[PDB]
Every structure is written in structure tokens, then in C-alpha cells.
Amino acid sequence: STGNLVSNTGLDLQQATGYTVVAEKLNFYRFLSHFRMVHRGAFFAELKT
Amino acid sequence: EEKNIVRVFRAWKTAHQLVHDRGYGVSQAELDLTLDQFKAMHCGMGRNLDRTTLSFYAKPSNDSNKGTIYIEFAKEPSVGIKEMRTFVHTLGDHNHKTGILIYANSMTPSAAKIIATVTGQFTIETFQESDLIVNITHHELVPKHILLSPDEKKELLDRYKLRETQLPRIQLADPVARYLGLKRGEVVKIVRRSETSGRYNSYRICA
Amino acid sequence: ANMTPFSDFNQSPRNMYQCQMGKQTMGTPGTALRYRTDNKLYRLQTGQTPVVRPKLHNTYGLDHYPNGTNAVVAVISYTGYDMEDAMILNKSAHERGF
Amino acid sequence: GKAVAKEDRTTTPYMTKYERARILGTRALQISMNAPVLVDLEGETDPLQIAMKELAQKKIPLLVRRYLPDGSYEDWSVAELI
Amino acid sequence: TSDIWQDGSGKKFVGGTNTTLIALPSVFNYLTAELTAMNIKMMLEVK
Amino acid sequence: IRPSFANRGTSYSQYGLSIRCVRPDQSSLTNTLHYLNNGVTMFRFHWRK
Amino acid sequence: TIRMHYANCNSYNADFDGDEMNMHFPQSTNARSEAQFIANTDSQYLVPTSGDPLRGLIQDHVVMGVWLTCKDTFYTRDEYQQLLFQALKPDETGMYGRIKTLPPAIQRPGIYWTGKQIISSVLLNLKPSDRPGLNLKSKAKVPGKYWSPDSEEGSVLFDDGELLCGILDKSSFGASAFGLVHSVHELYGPDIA
Amino acid sequence: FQVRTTGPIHNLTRQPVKIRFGEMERDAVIGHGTSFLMQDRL
Amino acid sequence: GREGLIDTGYLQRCLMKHLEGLCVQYDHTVRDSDGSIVQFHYGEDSLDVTKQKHLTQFEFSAKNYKSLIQKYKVKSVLSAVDSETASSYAKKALKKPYKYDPVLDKYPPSRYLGSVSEKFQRAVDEYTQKNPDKLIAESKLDDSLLNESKFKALMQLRYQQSLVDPGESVGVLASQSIGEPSTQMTLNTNVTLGIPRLREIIMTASANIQTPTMTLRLNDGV
Amino acid sequence: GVNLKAIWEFYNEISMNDIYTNDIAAILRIYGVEAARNAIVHEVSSVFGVYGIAVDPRHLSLIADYMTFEGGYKAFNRMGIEYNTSPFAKMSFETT
Amino acid sequence: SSIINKCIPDGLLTKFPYNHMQTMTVSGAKGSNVNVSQISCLLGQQELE
Amino acid sequence: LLRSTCLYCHHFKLSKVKVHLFFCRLKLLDYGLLNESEMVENVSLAKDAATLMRIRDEFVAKSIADSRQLTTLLLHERKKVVRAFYHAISSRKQCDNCQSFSPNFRKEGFAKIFEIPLSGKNLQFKYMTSTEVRNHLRRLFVKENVVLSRLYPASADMFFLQNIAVPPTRFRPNIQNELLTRILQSSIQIASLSKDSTVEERRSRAFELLINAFVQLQHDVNSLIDSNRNPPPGIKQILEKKEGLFRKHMMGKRVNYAARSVISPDPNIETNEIGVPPVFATKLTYPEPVTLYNFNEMRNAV
Ligand SMILES: [Zn+2]
After folding, report:
1. Residues of chain I positioned with their CB less than 8 A from the CB of C12
2. Strand partners of residue I214
3. Three-state DSSP class for G61?
4. Mind listing the domains of chain B with CATH numbers?
């Protein structure tokens, strides 16, 4: 429901929040694209380079 | 190697130049001193043979302002008090109201305050070589600076209903301020050549 | 991005806006709507497949989620209201169930 | 303070771009609040444009004060401005 | 007697006559309120 | 090779080597090799965050 | 939905995709007079950064202006009258009684007006009661070599408020200096511009 | 699309409760040099 | 394309902060509202770009000049304004020797209809002599409809008639005229360029800049 | 890099016309105030000169003739913020 | 620059006045010559940063 | 300002001649004299120090007499001057008029202040209640009058608060009210504990509980005004919130009579006029006085 990975150890993962998306079915392409997308993490988004 | 000679020579076409740019008067020969002209004037066995004779003066072309000025070149680095207080009574006996000193390098601060008091009606002023060697007035980015009489200053403050603190200021440590020899409060009329619409005359003061 | 007519023609930023916006289209989000407990869904009533298509639009079974229709487009500076990217809609074709 | 004498007035004799604006503003205000009009109407209804017809002939009261930043001020009749 | 007056609690008083009416945005009034809440207050005069 | 190393382990350097080693149940943890300026290598790792 | 003209797009720089706006109305009379005279849209023609005007016509207007202005054009009496009125529509503006035209450039074997005569005509229709007609020569945007080697159009030239030669374009009218409309702004007051 | 001729005022500061005008717009009106308009609108 | 994508305002409360007042007082001595001057005859007084676009357009002014002479309404202007004092002193100041200050400093250009810019006089007279192909003159043939003095008066007229509105709050005009074109564009195609540069030079006005370069032209004997 | 003391020495190049990437500290400190004025004028005019935008030099005139008012040149931040006479704008802009 | 100088002023089908895109380009309305060059000749080198 | 004090000298730590110098400087700067207020330093030289102070004082008197017959520069000068003055007053440790060493004081961010007694060698030549230091500063203020007057005549309470004001319910429809209730509970506990103390290691436990409640009160205030302490917005936290006053409410504020809509262009209407739907023409209305001639229009509209 939340995505926040509350663990005594980060499980060797940089970021610890926003791990889940909601399968927004507004449109079928939005659906599939939600499934197949990947992301690198806002730890680099905070970094404009 | 011996580039010191060209240095101290060039220091004059900034010193003898600093006679008018002040209002005093000097032979057009002291402004047209060639490189070898200086050597011929101040020479000797050396090839160093310049010192102990680099000292001149000038009197006003306005015939007033009480009195005249005298320039001098103290070759000894960091002249200190044992050379500074000494070269004041020369100005006094010669009735030289204002004197000009040049030192290289690092004039000691301890031997600056105690002379700054005995200035009084006189003004030791102030420069030192290696920093003022060519005429900064000879430049593209510096407009024409002209002093003003309290007559003209009164006229300016009358035309604009001002108080003498409502105008733009110039700090005293400005190179052009000391160059012009400014007292704290006198109004400079500068001539901006800002080439967007003609050249005009702005006004500044010193506090 | 593959489901794009002649996608190898337009300057790439256009294709990029194409993906990002086509993911935000008012088409059918599915078929079994009667039992959808969602917040906000969107469905368009009169749908048809394109005339121009890449084959994989038929292969991937996209026949079961049309997202637009096929319009009679005429590029012309006629009206004077369609500049700054603007566009006009035939009244008749609109009331006719566009 | 002081009022500048009429004889010596250094302010621009021109109706400034701002002065016309404020002047017409208040003249519309007066006229709209049942003030006497010093120009014949031509069937005109907007109380404001009427002041335009008034200014166009410069037949208008309500001199203006120009304040010098020092503390002085000029008093220019609208008929006297350009 | 005419000059003097009373309080909502009944405290008699007198004076404080020189009073005028001024237009100002009420948000400034709120600022004065919360600034009085700091014991810091401005003394704005009028003509 | 990343500068962020040297500013933390000052005897270290940006030169380094890592591996994100993983158990058979897919439970990866990392451990970085820090080549320090003196010459030794420090065996960094993470536990209890 | 609130409607305005294109020529304001540029100044507001809005892309006309949906970007909404705030719409204000002054209460008193002085404020509305002030907005009416100082900051009326017609008094905002030269941006403050440099003198370059930014309000003006856009893609479609410059395009068909180029097409029509080209000397190859011709108009019977019907077209000329319909077009002149279509542009004028004085009633929606007022202040004007009756429409005046010019004679046709050619008469035989048939009367025909050119678009350049048309621009001259409209320019005449707005000529202030007593303000001498406009005389001017300024380069066009389209280089002359496009029309022909040693093409004569090249640069718009026209005296006393009558279009003589050259074709109008973005440089003539629009966000451009020393075209036609900019001289209009200077001469016949802004409101006529 | 939200019109507001008038409505509720704030609890504390009597402001129309939550259209925005100011803090960049102020620069605009004072750029035109249109004081009465500014004091009017704000 | 996508690179062009990832490549794609705090100044406007900086350059607007100290530039609130900056208003054009009536004496034509532009100050902040506190009382102290910043300039005389703002930025070469004539005016901000609006009514100074055609000052350079000598030809188009001289072309018709008859719509313009009535637009300026000479018969009213010449009534209450002075013209010959500053027009006379302008010649004497145009004598290159100093002790003849610019008339704008001596005579306010709001009423004395001879007081204009210096470079303005240089340009207008230079144009008068170089290609006067439309201004006739010899002078015996001028007295039909033109005059050397006529167009000269027209130009002195346009300048005086195109002064700044005394009372323009200009500091924010410039604040806009920098802020808008600033964030207008920020992308590049070594010296630090763009808004970082303008930031260091204006916003922090700092010693120790990042790409400090000097440039000196050489002489003949090298 | 900038060392004016140094360029004083050589006479191969004319010691009058010398463009500068600003470092307006140095140019102001040892050329006078007006030098700094014209310098930042031409400087920012170039800063926009690299772009296809033209900014009439009058606004540049004003920015310049103000930034250098005191006799030095003041940055449009806490320092220049801290000297205005109106206790309201100062209350309004950065920190109440 | 060579092949562009050769093709676009004359290589294409219909000449300046009747060509509606030549118009929208050269009249300053919308586009530029670099646009007709890309669409009609070539794309050139892809300068990325 | 306390740190710069001298309890035994009853003065500041500084020399009275430097204090007098800065006094002359500020007085002559007051009337708009800057280079003259800087010329007060061209005087070179307790009795002799008093004579120099006479020299400087009389020079200010004269220069004022000449000047008699505000701007950014002046305040920019006064501010720098007082900065240097304070940097100087904060440095001296030993008295010059008292020649003694006042017992220094150590502060705390948690609103706690005091320090240890004097040193033995210094005799040769913590946290407690606020009333003592309050009277300390009151004594300094009444004693050092002229300079302080130039600085800010009455200066006693400017740093402390005997009774704070409460706003009407009109501004408090909450959190602020609760914080006031808390500080009142604090003040009633203080009054009670003080009465317990005056009516009475008894002093140990009594002073312990007393200073505990004193600090709880002072921390209650510190929390009420500022929220950064006592880990609940404080007043300063709602002003400098950057989300409240002076920008969301003073320069930019919502208004009446202003619509907000999406735009579409139109070529028919005008470059000047804007075409508006009738909805807004209804929902946007403005006042109008009625004269005799515009009467028919207004009547028709009604
Ligand atoms: Zn003591």
C-alpha cells in the first residue's frame, strides 16, 4: 500500500521509498507501459547532470 | 636584468604628468622625457646612477591654493620613520604645502600614524611605485575627472536644492581620488563618454 | 513507440511527445467495466481501428482497445481560427457522434 | 516648506504621460457625481469620455501640483500646461 | 461630564479625544495584532 | 572510479572495486574494495545500515 | 471561453494550449481611465528591453499577405469592394461614415485592381483627417532574387500613403522595426496603429 | 474556470478564502507607473 | 533529440529589491525615493526605447515631416518654451575645447528647446551635410518648402518632444528588461556563460570569478 | 587569470586598451570607479551579446550607475539589502 | 553546406512563389531553411553536447 | 550587551574615552555629517582622557553649530559604526574605569544563563533567576545614558517581559490559545512555588524546584514564540514561514472582481477588445453613480 521499505537494513538498495506504483488503468497503453517501465531512482534525479 | 631604470623613468610620466590633472603647471619637456632623455638627465658611472636626484616640484597655474607642491622619490625600501619625518621639514621650510612620496616596498604601518598627525595643514600624499607607474587617466574606460571650486560646488548644490550628502560618493582609497589629490568633501565633475547619446558630466563627492 | 505509423519519419521529439501523450488517451481501458470499482475511468463511445497501422497492432490484439477514430483531415489555411497549433471540428461530424 | 513662485517654474511645461491620465480620471469622477460641465454635450453618455471632449479644448479646471523631491511644488493650471 | 465617559466594565475615564478615521487594509491590522503579541508596536502618526 | 570515496576515507582514493554478491534466495549484499593511497585495500561492507 | 486576438499571443507569450489567465476589472473611474489611457493594449507596442515591437501579425497573415501583395494579382470590382469592406467593417468600430476607394489600376480591356492598390486603399481609409500620407522605403523580408534575378520588388517603396512597389511580409508588418506598421505607430498615433 | 465576485473572508485576516494577484504582478503595475490601478486592485 | 530534451527566477526579487523606487523626479534628476541621485538625464536622458526608435531614422523623418510637424503641434510648443539660448550654447559647446559643458547639464532639456544630446548634434549635423539629397541646400532655391534650419528645428523638436515622462518608476523597468530575457534562454552550443555569469557579476558581484581572462592588443613593433 | 601589476611591465603591447573578463573587484580596486562602471556595462552587454537578444544600454546604464553608487559596487543581496531606509521593504523581502 | 547550397534553391519541384513551404519558411512565418534542408536533403552530423 | 557589562565598574568593560568617541561619532552623523564625524579621530593625546573627551565633545558641538545654519549613505555608515562599536565592546574583559574583572556569564540556547565567580588572582584586583541580571542591565542603562540613548530616554525593560498581551478571539479562532493556556499554567505554578519559597538542604530542594519551574516557564515562552525549540508553529514561524505573511498575504493576495478562465484566440474581434462570454458579463459588475443624462441607460440596465 505504501512502498516504504522499513527494514533494519536497506537490503543493499540506495533509496528506501516510492517502491510501488498503482496500475493506473486510465488507458490500455498507460496500463502496459506501467508494467514494462523501469526506473533508476531519484537518488540521481536529485542530481541534475 | 636592469629593468629598474625603465620602471623609475616611466614613474615620472605618471608623476610629472600628475602636475596638471591637478591644476599645477610644468614645462612640456617634463612630459616629453624620452627613455634616453631620463638617462641623460640622471646618469653617471652606472647603469644604476639614478637615485638621490629624483625629486621635483610644481607651483599652481591658478596662482593660488596656497601653496605649491613638491614631489620626491625615496629609493630606500620601507623608508620607515627615520626617513619619513625627515622629509617633511623640507616641505615645511620650502613652504611646500603638499608633498608626494613614493616607496618600494612595504612602508611600515608603525611609521605611518605618527606622521599622519604631524601632517596637519600639510598633506603627505601618498603613493608608491610599482602600482602607479603609467597614467591611469590614459585609458579608454576612465572619463575626464575635473575638480571644482566651492563657487561651482555652491552653484551645483543651488541648481539642485540638494544637501551635500545627497550626491554620489567616492571613497578615499580610490586610485583616481589620491591621484587627483582629493580632500574629503570636494565635488568632482566627471565627464562620462558613454556613447549611447553624447558625453555628459556626472558629479561625485568624497567623504 | 512501435505502434506508430511510419515512426521512422518525424523528428524524434515528436515521437517522444507521441508516446508520453498517447499514454494519456481517452480510449477504452478495457471491456469488463461493469465490475470496476475505480475512482476515475474514461471511455470513448464510437471507436474504430486506424486505416494506417503497423502489423503488431493487429498481432498484439489491439483490436480490442481502440483509442480514437479516423478523421477526414484537410490541411488548409481557410478559417483563421486555427493558428498557434489550433484546430477546427466540423459541427455535423461532431453532433453525428464524434 | 515653500510654494514655488509661478514666475520661476522649471518643471516640464509638457502634460506628462501620467498627468493626462490622472486629470481625466478625476474629471470623469466630478462629472459623474453631478458636476457642472464646461463643454456642450453631443449626445454623449459616458461620464468619462465627456472629460475627453473637455480636455481636447483645454477648458478644464483642476490645476495640478508638481512636488519637487526637496519639498517645493509647482501649481500648474491645466490651461497652462501644453 | 460631557468629556468624561465610562468603560464596558464601568471604569470612568476622560480624554483621548484626538481621534480620526483612516483607511487601511485589515491585514495590516492583523500584523499589528500579532506584533503587539510581541510587545513590539509601531506608533503611526497622522496629519 | 568515483571522487566521493576519497573525501570520506581520506587515506583512500577514487579508485575502487565492488561486487553485489547475492545468496541463492536472491538476498544480495554489497562489499566495496577501497584502494587506499598508502597501498592496502579496505574491505568495506554494510550491516545494520 | 474568453476570446482575444492573436497579436496579443506574442506579448503574453502564451502558447494557446490551455494556459489560463487572470481577468481583472478596476472599480473606480480613475483606475479604469488610467488603464484605458496609459496601459491600454494599444499603448504597449514597443517592448521595454529594446525598441523592437512584439505585437503584430503571425504565420497566416504574413503568408497570405505575401501572396496577395505579389504584383501578379488582380481583382474585379466585386472582389475589390467585398475585400475592402471585409477589412474595414467600420460600424463595429464606428467613428466613420462612408467608404472611399481608388480608381482601378487598369481599365482596358477590363477594370482590375491589384492587391497593392488594395493596401493603398485601406491605408487611405484610415488616413487621419489632416495628416499627410506616408512616404517610405524599407527592405522586405523575402530577398529579391526569389521573384526574379534583378527582381524589382525587393523592398517596399511607397509615398504619400500609396503602396507603390515591393511586397509586404513579416518585416513590413508584424514584430519588426521600420516596416510599415511601425512607421504607422510613429506617425498617425498609436490608436491608429 | 473559477469566477469570484466576492465570497467568504478569512477567519483571521478577512481575505477571500482559498485569485492570486501580486508579488510579481506588483512589479508589472508599478512598471506601467499606474499607482491608482495598484492601490485599486490590491 | 532526447539530449536536446534533458538540456531544456530568484533574480527578479534581487534586481527588483533595491530597484523599487528609482523614479524620474520632475527636475529630471533621477533618484530613488529616498532623496539621493543616481543619474542626471536618465541613461542619456532622451528616453527608454519606446520613443527613441526613430531618432536614428533621419531619412524617414526628413521624408515627409509634414504629418510630423502637425503631430508635434509646433504652434503651441513654441509659445511657452525657450529655444535660442540652448541652441546658441550648443554651438559653443560643440567647440571641442572644454569650459563649454554639455547643454543638458547647463540647460534642462524639458523647456529649453535647444538642449539635446551631444552625439545627437554630431549625428544630425553630420547627416545634414553628408547626404542632404532630400534637403535642398543655393539657399535661394530653398524657400519653396524646406529649410536646413527647418529640419534642424524639427529634430531639436523631436528630441525635446520625446523626453522621459517625469515620474516613471524605471528601476523595475530595467529589472524586467533583464529578468525576462535572462530566463528567456539558458542552453549552450572556456568561459562560464549564461545565467551563472550574470549571477556572479550582478547578483553576488564577487571577487574571484571562475573564468577571469584579460585581453591586450599588440603593437606594430612586435 | 588577472595580474595587472604584471602587464604594466611589458611594452610590446599597448598598455591602454585591455579588455577584461570582469573580476570587477580588481578592475575597480586599481582602475577607479568609472572604469568599473563602463566595464560592467560592456560586460553584461556582452553577456546578452552571446544571445540573439539586444538590451538597450539605458537599462544597463541604470543598473551600472546604481550598483556602483556608494563608491564601491554592492551586491544585490544581504549587504545591499541591509542599507535601505524603508523598514518595510527590508521587512518584506528576504527575512521578516 | 555544399549539397544544401546545391539542392534547396532549385533542386526541388516547384519554384519559390508557388511552393507553399518555401513561402512559410522564407517569409519568416514558420520554420527555416535548415528545416527544409533536413526534410528534403539530409540530416548531417548529430552534434550531441 | 550583558557580556560587555562590568558589574564592579558599573560600566562597560571599554574605556570611557572610546565610548565617548563613538558617542560623538553617532551624534555628528545624526545631523548628516559623515566626513566630519570621521574627522573626530584627528585628535591625539582619568583627567587627560576627560580633556580629550572635552575636545571631541566641543568639536561636535561646533560642527553641529555650523551644520545647523536621512539617506542610504548615512544609515549605511551608522550601521557599520555600531557593528564596530559592538565588536569592540564584546572584546574587553577587564574594566578600565573600574580596572576590575566582572564575573563573566555563560549562556545557553535552551534559555539558560550564568557562570562561576571570580578568580583569586582577579580577586586581588550555571543558571539562576533572571531578576538579578535584569536589575544588572537596568543599573547599566540608567547609569550609561547618553550613548545608549544615541543607540536606541528609557531603556530598562527592552529585553524582558513582565506581562504579555493577548489578542482578541477575532484573531484566534487553536494552537496559539493552547500555548497561552500552557504558559498561564506555568505562571500560576510559579506564583505558587514562589509563595511556597517565601513562606518556606531546604534551600537546596526549594531552589531546585523553583529554578525548575522558572526554566519550564522560560522554555514555555521560548516554545510559544519560536517553534524551533522544545521538540507547533511559533509566531515568528508563521511570519517568516515564506508561506504566510508579507508574500502570500501582503504583496500577493487574492482579490475580488477578477475571473480566471482558459483562452482561445479570435481574428474577428479586435487587437484591442477581448471577447467575453455573457456569463462573466453577468458575474462581473462595477459601481456607477447616476447623473441625469446617463439616467436612461442605467434605468434600462436596471
Ligand atoms: Zn569595574
Report:
1. 1-2
2. J20
3. helix
4. 1-134 (3.40.1340.10), 135-207 (3.90.940.20)
